[PDB]
Design a protein around this ligand. Sequence first.
Ligand SMILES: Cc1cc2c(cc1C(=O)O)C(C)(C)CCCC2
Length: 133
Amino acid sequence: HMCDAFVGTWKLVSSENFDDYMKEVGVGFATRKVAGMAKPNMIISVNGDVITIKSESTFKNTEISFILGQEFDEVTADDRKVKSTITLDGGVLVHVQKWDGKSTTIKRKREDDKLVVECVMKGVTSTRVYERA
Ligand SMILES: Cc1cc2c(cc1C(=O)O)C(C)(C)CCCC2
């Protein structure tokens, strides 16, 4: 019953500051424009100790599977090759990505009937809000 309140299919309903977050990460103009238009569904499931998170949109379909605390290599939707570790910290899923001496953190939390995603790169934060699909 690890992550039960996260499991399901979620749809993006609002975004703030995502273009600025992508700029801080190093995403180029064309990819920012198309990515910023995306309205993903996020699908989260658990089978034993393995968590799977899928993001599906017209921009890209991605999938990661992982065990908490156990690093993995990830190819991001913007084509970064990163080393990722995802942990649970006080009920929040915390996803750290490292690449080229840089780091970004993506936090997922349940708030009311929403799943709120905060993406942070240095001083720039983007908030993406999801509801059940
Ligand atoms: C649509 C989308 C695009 C991108 C991302 C996430 C999402 C998403 O909504 O999950 C990264 C987290 C890889 C950030 C860089 C730009 C590419």
